[PDB]
Amino acid sequence: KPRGLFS
Amino acid sequence: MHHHHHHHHHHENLYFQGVRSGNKAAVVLCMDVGFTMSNSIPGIESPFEQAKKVITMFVQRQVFAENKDEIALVLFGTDGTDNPLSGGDQYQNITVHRHLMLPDFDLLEDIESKIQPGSQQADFLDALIVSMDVIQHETIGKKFEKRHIEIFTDLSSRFSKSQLDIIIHSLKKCDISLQFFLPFSLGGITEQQKEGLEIVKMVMISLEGEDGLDEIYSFSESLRKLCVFKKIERHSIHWPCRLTIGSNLSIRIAAYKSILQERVKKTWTVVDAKTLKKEDIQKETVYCLNDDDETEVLKEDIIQGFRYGSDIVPFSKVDEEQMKYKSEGKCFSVLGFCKSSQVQRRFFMGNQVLKVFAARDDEAAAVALSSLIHALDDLDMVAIVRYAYDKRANPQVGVAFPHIKHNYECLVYVQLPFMEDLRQYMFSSLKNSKKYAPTEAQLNAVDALIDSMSLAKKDEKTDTLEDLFPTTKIPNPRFQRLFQCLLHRALHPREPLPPIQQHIWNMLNPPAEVTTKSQIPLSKIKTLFPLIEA
Amino acid sequence: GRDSLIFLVDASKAMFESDELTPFDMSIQCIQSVYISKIISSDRDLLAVVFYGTEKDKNSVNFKNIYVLQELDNPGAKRILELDQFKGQQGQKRFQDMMGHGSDYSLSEVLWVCANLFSDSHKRIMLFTNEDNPHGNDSAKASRARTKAGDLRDTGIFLDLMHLKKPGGFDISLFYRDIISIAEDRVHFEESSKLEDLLRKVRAKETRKRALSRLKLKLNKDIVISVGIYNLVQKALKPPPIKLYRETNEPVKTKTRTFNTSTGGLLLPSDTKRSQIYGSRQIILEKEETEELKRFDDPGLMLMGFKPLVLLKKHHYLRPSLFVYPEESLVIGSSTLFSALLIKCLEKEVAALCRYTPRRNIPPYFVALVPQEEELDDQKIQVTPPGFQLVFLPFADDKRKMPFTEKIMATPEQVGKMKAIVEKLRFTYRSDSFENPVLQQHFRNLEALALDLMEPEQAVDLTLPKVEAMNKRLGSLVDEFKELVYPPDY
DNA sequence: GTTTTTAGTTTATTGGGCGCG
DNA sequence: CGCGCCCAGCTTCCAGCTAATAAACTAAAAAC
């Protein structure tokens, strides 16, 4: 699942 | 459907746990502001300006987003040195611009105006150490579910490979995840860039494994993803109950909201035009008689009543409380089954869609429900059920229909209408209409219009139709628009509101191909169909 | 602003002749239903109840054999109670002994009494009879009735016939063909033999359509047709409470004002601003600006294109669908283009995708106009109106991600057992089968209080499953299914 | 003018032990 | 059996934390 900066 | 890593606690209601627990995250943005970050190729923007836009996009999204996620900003390649690990000959040209704090308009203003490109160069692995220190010294005080470090660099400068082992060990022990943002995609760089990239690859593989390589991005792709404001995502509360068929057959189920009319919780507070305070405003609801001269009444002289046609019936909240219809409580009881054709989609009621699965980790319930799902599907039938959220909620009559997809099977629940809500009105027939019957030419013009304006494409070699305009993927423009305006007023209070951003209009309009094709057919329709205002 | 409906009931010998209810009992029960429904929906229409062919007369001009039971007025508890006195076989005996029956009448005089009630918006007379050609024996009466009927139509009074079953059938061409008012383009309902059919036929002619909004459907900037948006379904809610004056039980008016706390003076809309706090800053907008940021397009339906119906998912329901019908009164030529679009959308099994703006200063929503073909039942009642079903489509924000679950599938033996269970509890679903338990109880409660019965009637919950009947109908299938799915230990 | 209806809010509750009447 | 009354997990002592959800509510737009 989209992580970090994208979450 | 969610990933397998997404735990079910996120969907259950517990006292300051589950959905109620804070999904707080600590994020350290590690930006390279070194001399080389300013060097650019004639056709493209400098890495410094590209990374600056990515960071702005990120922070802007976070400011309007519901999350209580905290952000720190470390800069490296700066002229001066200001960090907690500062030594006479150690961690030089590294500055902690912002410490772990909730993002604000002061941060955005600094990113846009105060931050300037540096004239020096710093070790990016040293900057990562300083970034790790920020998390290590500031996550102790508060509760953070996740810790992230985002590095924005061009990998142009020399670095020491001596601290690799401590870097990896601390990231693993502290459960800090990493991400790299570069001026180039991973899938004409200098030799130093090739060296730096190999180390970045090694680091990511050590931390994440094979998947590590997927965490290396270009500023270009990052800008593309972060241009829009955060799409509103909320976790639906799991609803436990038993699907009953008679009084002897029970199936443990867990229901969740799949569709809702989503809204932003924060709204407009009415404030005094001078003090700009809420406390200065007060509303007083006064009561007066229907008869002439407007005779006021005191709250100690008003009773509750209801109208029964021409009759006025006094009925206190106390008496109403006891005579009130009282539901047995939570339920999902099958009343019977019927042909799906007998349930028309025009009769769908309510403000939600419920997806019903078997109770969590219950194989027996899963098999039992799977039997129902497939039987209804194979019989082209649906279930008519009585649904009641809780002992307080008004009971509903609704449809539960099969939903079989790859990796998941469930029943879809939607409320049906009561006799009291059905106005059939009786509309004039248009087929019998001898006056409004279209000519052969008029029908052919509409036929040509429908073909030109098709929003779908066949022959994909999978016998599957490809949708050219998927509306359900587009985020609601009102939120995007509201946030654009709220941001504009915050950074520019004297300036009027900005016009709607072009990309917003671009996502609300069909493909340019559709618009072009329709021109000729539309022209034929304008001539064939006379139109004039009465 | 208040429409008027006069229920005119025949009291001839044949009305009290049959298992199945007498046409009279059917009529009384049908009228009560309209009265009760008009209360449930807080309708402001005026209702009246007149009988003819009775031995007794209660009209203002003392015309023979005409009884005005209820003058034109708002429905209430006492009026409903009064009608209930003529319900069933016991009621039939009460009516005949109170007023008499089978007496000679003259429809012309009957219509005069009715028209006079209006004199003492929309004026409608609903006639309940199983007698076609009542003045066949007297040409002088038949001619006077036609003249009077004609005068009413010329006045603007609508006369609708609710013809009930008669041996050999009810023939409209014999008489009433020159009495009933025709709005014009067979188009007449069949004779009523069941209460349910009489009810729908009456309620269909009773309530007039109300447009939710009159909007422009733009094929492009130049090609614009006019359409009406109608709900067809409306959430049946418990009427909100009303504030009364304790000593007189008189309704009280309520004014909500806004004033400065310090000054105490009234606050104009131009004396206040709108605030929202983000980051660590207060963002101030004018009321005018909060509306401006909500504006996209202009009100209406902007055609995006055509999407095949298969691409529209049933589980992507968001809010109740609306109904689109052409409005010829605004843009001439709207119905012709509408009809063509409808004919071709049906043929191609395609929907018209639109960007929908219901009012000024409101963000747009994507909707799918689903082609809907007209449908009439055995009684000639319009079950499905011809037009487009306005189906609201959810945005990405409106969709909710589901938690992860491993796919566990049942065996053919288990699916087979469930199939047998499904077949056992099969039934015919009709959108009008269930009543709102909450609403029904609320008004039963009000009835007891308005009439001072001191005993509230208890509503029978139609939403509760017929458990005992289901168990008997299933037999051993339940225990069979259990043995194949559920372990001995649970 | 009026009603009708809805878009847009605010607001109380949320679970499961335990004791008593 | 059915009401009400507490405690409930998380932070290197405890006090404030959190968020979906349905019904009730106001205020205003548009039809009438």
XYZ file of C-alpha atoms in Angstrom, chain B residues 1-8 11 63-65 103-106 109 230-237 244-252 255-264 266-291 294-315 317 320 323-325 328 333-340 342-353 355-358 362-376 378-379 381 384-386 394-397 401 403-409 412 414-439 442-444 446-451 453-456 465-467 469-479 481-483 485-487 489-491 493 495-498 500 504-505 507-510 514 519 522-523 525-526 529-534, chain C residues 36 38-43 73-80 184-187 189 201 203-205 207-211 216 219-220 222-225 228 230-262 267 270-286 289-290 292-297 303-308 310-321 323-326 328-345 347-348 350-351 353 355 362-367 370 372-376 381-387 389 391-411 414-416 418-451 456 458 461-468 470-471 474 478-479 481-482 484-487 490:
484
model
C -10.244 -4.193 -0.710
C -7.190 -3.442 1.482
C -3.713 -5.093 1.458
C -3.068 -8.142 3.751
C -0.773 -5.921 5.927
C -3.769 -3.647 6.844
C -4.948 -5.040 10.222
C -8.617 -5.321 11.218
C -12.005 -1.102 11.526
C -1.818 20.817 6.476
C -5.412 20.222 5.179
C -5.358 16.453 5.927
C 2.810 21.287 9.893
C 1.688 24.923 9.670
C 1.537 27.929 7.315
C 4.816 29.217 8.851
C 6.164 30.207 4.033
C -5.620 14.177 -0.091
C -8.699 12.117 -1.136
C -10.931 11.644 1.944
C -10.359 8.125 3.355
C -12.067 6.921 6.575
C -12.143 3.410 8.058
C -15.681 1.946 8.220
C -16.599 0.515 11.674
C -30.903 -15.255 10.627
C -32.992 -17.584 8.434
C -35.924 -18.448 10.696
C -35.076 -18.984 14.393
C -32.895 -22.109 14.128
C -30.363 -21.008 11.448
C -27.892 -18.260 12.381
C -24.808 -16.996 10.489
C -22.235 -14.798 12.270
C -20.861 -5.630 7.945
C -19.000 -2.488 6.745
C -20.017 0.721 4.888
C -18.809 0.535 1.261
C -20.460 3.707 -0.170
C -21.221 7.051 1.605
C -21.748 10.685 0.737
C -18.357 11.721 2.236
C -17.901 15.193 3.761
C -15.197 17.313 5.449
C -14.447 21.067 9.654
C -16.923 23.758 8.467
C -17.359 27.538 8.566
C -17.508 29.197 12.002
C -19.544 32.434 11.997
C -17.446 35.164 13.699
C -17.695 38.935 14.379
C -16.332 40.987 11.432
C -14.250 43.062 13.904
C -12.980 40.784 16.726
C -12.990 37.744 14.374
C -14.067 35.763 17.475
C -16.895 33.211 17.916
C -17.758 34.202 21.548
C -18.955 37.667 20.351
C -21.872 35.969 18.484
C -25.019 34.581 20.185
C -28.364 33.248 18.864
C -31.599 33.584 20.869
C -34.756 31.772 19.715
C -37.847 33.706 20.967
C -41.500 32.457 21.021
C -44.647 34.452 20.150
C -48.365 33.725 19.585
C -50.031 33.182 16.154
C -52.601 35.879 17.162
C -46.886 39.316 18.681
C -47.400 38.119 22.311
C -44.134 36.616 23.666
C -44.112 33.350 25.695
C -41.647 32.106 28.357
C -40.037 28.617 28.078
C -41.895 27.694 31.325
C -45.229 27.909 29.384
C -44.512 25.799 26.247
C -45.474 22.113 25.808
C -44.820 19.545 23.040
C -47.521 18.624 20.525
C -48.136 17.054 17.116
C -50.529 17.651 14.268
C -52.989 14.955 13.192
C -54.443 16.709 10.161
C -56.586 19.582 11.517
C -56.209 18.267 15.097
C -53.507 19.538 17.464
C -52.443 16.783 19.866
C -50.406 17.664 23.008
C -47.905 14.830 23.554
C -41.522 13.732 25.356
C -43.954 9.807 23.607
C -45.790 4.813 23.671
C -42.940 5.046 21.068
C -42.339 2.019 18.825
C -35.982 -5.566 19.611
C -33.205 -11.211 9.527
C -34.131 -12.836 6.189
C -37.835 -12.417 5.386
C -37.606 -14.379 2.147
C -35.982 -14.579 -1.284
C -37.177 -13.405 -4.691
C -36.084 -13.004 -8.345
C -33.515 -10.173 -8.733
C -38.512 -8.115 -8.856
C -36.058 -5.674 -7.177
C -35.529 -2.627 -9.427
C -32.522 -0.350 -8.834
C -34.819 2.746 -9.097
C -36.274 1.716 -5.709
C -32.888 1.732 -3.865
C -33.133 3.858 -0.674
C -30.897 5.287 2.069
C -27.526 7.042 2.319
C -25.231 3.940 2.548
C -24.289 0.600 0.967
C -20.933 -5.023 2.375
C -21.616 -8.110 4.502
C -18.855 -10.658 5.146
C -18.688 -13.598 7.547
C -14.732 -17.712 11.308
C -14.379 -20.463 8.651
C -17.768 -22.070 9.557
C -19.546 -18.717 9.032
C -17.512 -18.126 5.813
C -18.586 -21.496 4.282
C -22.223 -20.933 5.413
C -22.330 -17.426 3.884
C -20.519 -18.601 0.697
C -23.331 -21.175 0.289
C -25.969 -18.377 0.430
C -24.019 -16.071 -1.958
C -23.512 -18.745 -4.660
C -27.068 -20.176 -4.325
C -28.599 -16.704 -4.867
C -26.886 -19.440 -9.402
C -30.661 -18.914 -8.946
C -32.246 -14.322 -6.798
C -35.275 -9.403 1.365
C -34.180 -8.616 4.925
C -35.068 -6.618 8.061
C -35.488 2.757 13.017
C -35.804 -0.751 11.447
C -35.395 -1.001 7.662
C -36.517 -3.410 4.950
C -27.671 -9.421 -3.166
C -21.291 -10.091 -4.947
C -18.703 -12.606 -6.259
C -15.330 -11.180 -7.292
C -11.731 -12.469 -7.429
C -10.196 -12.733 -3.870
C -13.554 -11.862 -2.110
C -17.257 -12.845 -1.907
C -24.373 -6.223 -0.706
C -29.147 -1.601 0.330
C -32.373 -0.293 1.932
C -35.660 -0.706 0.039
C -38.705 1.634 0.367
C -41.807 1.466 2.618
C -45.324 1.913 1.172
C -45.434 5.390 2.819
C -42.494 6.684 0.741
C -43.754 5.738 -2.739
C -45.183 8.486 -5.001
C -45.793 6.902 -8.439
C -47.297 10.285 -9.750
C -48.573 8.799 -13.139
C -46.621 10.489 -16.027
C -47.918 11.121 -19.567
C -46.917 8.444 -22.153
C -44.475 9.530 -24.869
C -44.737 6.437 -27.117
C -48.493 6.953 -27.717
C -47.706 10.679 -28.402
C -48.586 11.383 -31.989
C -47.161 14.969 -31.639
C -43.624 14.237 -30.321
C -42.744 11.137 -32.421
C -39.223 11.650 -33.949
C -38.667 11.262 -37.721
C -33.904 12.589 -36.284
C -33.494 9.025 -34.914
C -30.445 8.411 -37.157
C -29.225 10.630 -32.310
C -27.915 7.155 -33.287
C -24.791 8.795 -34.824
C -24.403 11.096 -31.762
C -24.470 8.137 -29.316
C -21.791 6.269 -31.355
C -19.896 10.197 -27.914
C -19.142 6.621 -26.714
C -17.287 6.624 -23.375
C -16.167 2.981 -23.833
C -14.928 -3.203 -22.337
C -12.493 -0.417 -21.419
C -14.075 2.651 -19.780
C -14.175 8.084 -18.507
C -14.125 6.462 -15.013
C -15.980 8.935 -12.732
C -15.631 6.811 -9.526
C -11.805 7.276 -9.653
C -12.090 11.111 -9.666
C -11.975 12.850 -6.241
C -14.893 15.218 -5.364
C -13.822 18.628 -6.736
C -15.439 20.608 -3.864
C -12.752 19.518 -1.372
C -11.388 23.567 -4.546
C -12.038 24.432 -0.893
C -8.457 23.546 0.097
C -8.936 28.569 -1.607
C -8.208 28.024 2.119
C -4.482 27.804 1.236
C -6.318 32.986 1.734
C -3.706 31.777 4.277
C -0.613 32.652 2.200
C -4.830 37.422 2.846
C -5.653 38.839 -2.550
C -9.130 37.728 -3.785
C -9.930 34.022 -4.331
C -8.085 32.246 -7.186
C -10.523 26.955 -10.448
C -9.578 20.110 -11.897
C -11.572 21.131 -14.999
C -10.463 15.715 -14.759
C -14.195 16.699 -14.821
C -14.325 16.757 -18.663
C -14.463 13.712 -21.020
C -14.980 12.237 -27.433
C -18.926 18.006 -33.285
C -24.049 17.597 -32.755
C -24.247 20.003 -35.733
C -28.840 17.433 -34.362
C -29.053 21.264 -34.045
C -34.295 19.262 -33.822
C -35.955 22.727 -33.604
C -35.408 24.214 -30.111
C -36.877 27.565 -28.879
C -37.763 29.058 -25.449
C -41.486 29.717 -24.724
C -55.151 8.492 6.699
C -53.247 12.582 3.692
C -52.558 12.802 7.450
C -49.336 10.690 7.382
C -47.922 13.013 4.663
C -49.249 16.254 6.340
C -51.190 17.111 3.129
C -62.376 20.480 5.165
C -58.954 19.235 6.412
C -59.001 15.533 7.456
C -58.859 14.658 11.159
C -59.391 11.950 13.780
C -63.207 12.360 14.173
C -63.779 12.376 10.363
C -61.767 9.108 10.010
C -56.272 14.131 -23.838
C -52.958 13.038 -25.517
C -57.655 3.635 -24.811
C -55.993 5.416 -21.750
C -58.208 2.149 -16.088
C -56.298 4.002 -9.125
C -54.371 7.669 -5.219
C -52.926 7.897 -8.816
C -55.523 10.494 -9.952
C -51.986 13.496 -6.011
C -50.498 15.731 -8.717
C -46.824 15.613 -9.707
C -44.408 18.075 -8.094
C -41.124 18.919 -9.868
C -31.684 22.566 -18.699
C -26.117 18.368 -25.225
C -23.619 21.214 -25.815
C -26.090 25.600 -28.168
C -28.387 22.504 -27.961
C -30.378 22.843 -24.707
C -33.633 21.022 -23.843
C -38.248 18.238 -14.961
C -38.947 14.351 -9.857
C -38.252 12.249 -6.741
C -40.699 9.233 -7.213
C -39.479 8.056 -3.728
C -39.501 10.203 -0.571
C -38.260 9.173 2.924
C -41.328 8.764 5.155
C -40.374 10.742 8.287
C -42.015 11.234 11.698
C -43.539 14.775 11.660
C -41.403 17.163 13.766
C -42.911 18.314 17.108
C -44.733 21.669 17.397
C -44.442 24.129 20.298
C -47.754 24.978 22.015
C -48.902 27.395 24.740
C -49.624 25.280 27.897
C -52.817 27.194 28.913
C -54.515 27.278 25.439
C -52.740 24.438 23.457
C -52.299 27.075 20.716
C -49.321 26.797 18.291
C -46.464 29.256 18.883
C -44.377 31.112 16.238
C -40.561 30.973 16.648
C -38.032 33.660 15.624
C -34.274 32.919 15.742
C -32.176 36.113 15.907
C -28.402 36.738 16.189
C -26.952 39.547 18.342
C -23.558 40.779 19.586
C -22.994 39.491 23.177
C -21.445 42.815 24.364
C -26.454 41.284 13.729
C -22.902 42.014 6.589
C -21.803 42.335 10.293
C -20.332 38.785 10.460
C -17.569 36.830 8.629
C -16.692 33.139 8.052
C -13.696 31.444 9.752
C -11.785 28.114 9.520
C -8.556 27.249 11.398
C -5.774 25.356 9.558
C -2.151 24.823 10.585
C -1.905 27.445 13.257
C -3.717 30.196 11.365
C -7.239 31.650 11.180
C -8.495 31.837 7.575
C -11.217 34.466 7.077
C -13.649 34.519 4.147
C -16.744 36.617 3.447
C -16.822 34.039 -0.922
C -17.861 30.807 0.847
C -18.283 31.511 -4.666
C -15.801 28.675 -3.911
C -18.747 26.215 -4.201
C -19.543 27.409 -7.766
C -18.668 25.261 -10.817
C -20.737 25.248 -14.071
C -23.936 15.853 -21.332
C -20.558 14.132 -21.028
C -21.345 11.206 -23.311
C -22.815 7.714 -23.425
C -21.733 4.811 -21.245
C -23.008 1.220 -21.749
C -23.077 -2.958 -18.060
C -20.390 -0.505 -16.806
C -22.791 0.877 -14.159
C -22.497 -1.213 -10.988
C -25.524 -1.968 -8.789
C -23.366 -1.786 -5.630
C -22.332 1.801 -6.548
C -25.539 3.246 -5.038
C -24.966 6.535 -3.165
C -28.370 8.262 -2.654
C -31.945 7.715 -4.033
C -32.366 8.079 -7.798
C -36.630 10.875 -12.491
C -36.112 12.978 -15.625
C -39.105 13.956 -17.794
C -39.284 16.598 -20.613
C -42.346 21.291 -23.106
C -43.636 24.486 -21.367
C -40.089 25.983 -21.158
C -38.244 24.871 -24.348
C -40.437 23.950 -27.335
C -39.040 20.831 -29.050
C -37.678 19.255 -25.817
C -40.028 16.197 -25.887
C -39.148 15.176 -29.504
C -35.362 15.175 -28.821
C -35.977 13.562 -25.403
C -38.083 10.761 -27.028
C -35.359 10.135 -29.658
C -32.634 9.960 -26.966
C -34.840 7.582 -24.942
C -35.622 5.307 -27.948
C -31.945 5.044 -28.991
C -30.497 4.720 -25.447
C -31.966 0.119 -28.244
C -28.202 0.465 -27.607
C -26.484 2.747 -23.063
C -26.805 5.543 -20.436
C -23.457 10.420 -18.469
C -22.325 16.589 -14.878
C -23.178 23.941 -5.743
C -20.314 21.586 -6.769
C -21.053 19.148 -9.623
C -21.874 15.446 -9.422
C -21.636 12.731 -12.013
C -24.944 11.060 -12.814
C -30.701 5.334 -17.277
C -36.667 3.713 -18.579
C -39.504 2.273 -20.738
C -43.197 2.771 -19.794
C -45.056 -0.145 -18.152
C -48.778 -0.628 -17.414
C -52.110 1.515 -13.991
C -48.720 3.087 -14.838
C -46.253 0.938 -12.876
C -43.159 2.415 -14.611
C -43.178 5.951 -16.128
C -41.334 6.585 -19.458
C -38.121 8.638 -19.129
C -33.611 7.279 -14.115
C -28.605 7.565 -11.011
C -26.036 9.326 -8.794
C -22.446 8.125 -9.232
C -19.953 8.189 -6.315
C -16.637 10.112 -6.434
C -13.414 8.382 -5.263
C -13.909 10.001 -1.778
C -17.363 8.327 -1.470
C -15.934 4.816 -1.819
C -14.625 3.031 1.271
C -11.813 0.444 1.296
C -12.784 -2.972 2.763
C -10.659 -4.966 5.289
C -8.739 -8.018 4.028
C -10.366 -11.518 4.140
C -9.193 -14.856 2.666
C -11.656 -16.271 0.085
C -13.328 -19.405 1.550
C -15.729 -21.165 -0.863
C -18.522 -23.696 -0.153
C -18.750 -27.160 -1.790
C -23.441 -27.125 0.535
C -24.528 -24.727 -2.276
C -27.131 -27.364 -3.254
C -28.726 -23.714 0.431
C -30.443 -23.704 -3.029
C -33.154 -26.006 -1.545
C -33.514 -23.577 1.418
C -33.705 -20.534 -0.929
C -36.434 -22.284 -3.024
C -38.417 -23.096 0.173
C -38.553 -19.438 1.338
C -39.330 -18.013 -2.123
C -41.951 -15.216 -2.323
C -43.262 -12.435 -4.625
C -41.688 -9.067 -3.769
C -43.697 -5.875 -4.351
C -42.322 -2.398 -3.457
C -45.669 -1.629 -1.620
C -45.642 -4.737 0.685
C -44.095 -3.216 3.844
C -45.273 -0.421 6.152
C -42.978 1.726 8.360
C -43.470 0.329 11.918
C -42.299 3.603 13.504
C -44.689 5.833 11.483
C -47.695 3.501 11.869
C -47.288 3.384 15.671
C -46.786 7.201 15.890
C -50.153 7.917 14.236
C -51.970 5.101 16.078
C -50.737 6.897 19.239
C -51.998 10.289 17.997
C -55.446 8.721 17.178
C -55.863 7.471 20.780
C -54.951 10.943 22.136
C -57.024 13.044 19.657
C -60.193 10.951 20.198
C -53.474 3.055 21.671
C -50.803 -1.597 18.450
C -44.834 -5.276 12.397
C -44.776 -6.542 8.782
C -40.955 -6.239 8.818
C -40.590 -9.069 11.396
C -39.921 -12.510 9.815
C -42.700 -15.101 9.928
C -40.327 -17.351 12.027
C -42.779 -20.190 12.941
C -40.508 -20.465 7.961
C -39.373 -23.226 10.385
C -37.961 -25.631 5.993
C -31.851 -26.484 8.591
C -30.468 -29.439 10.621
C -27.274 -27.721 6.331
C -25.852 -27.379 9.899
C -22.618 -30.158 6.561
C -21.156 -26.775 7.691
C -21.040 -26.271 11.495
C -18.727 -28.496 13.607
C -18.735 -24.394 18.516
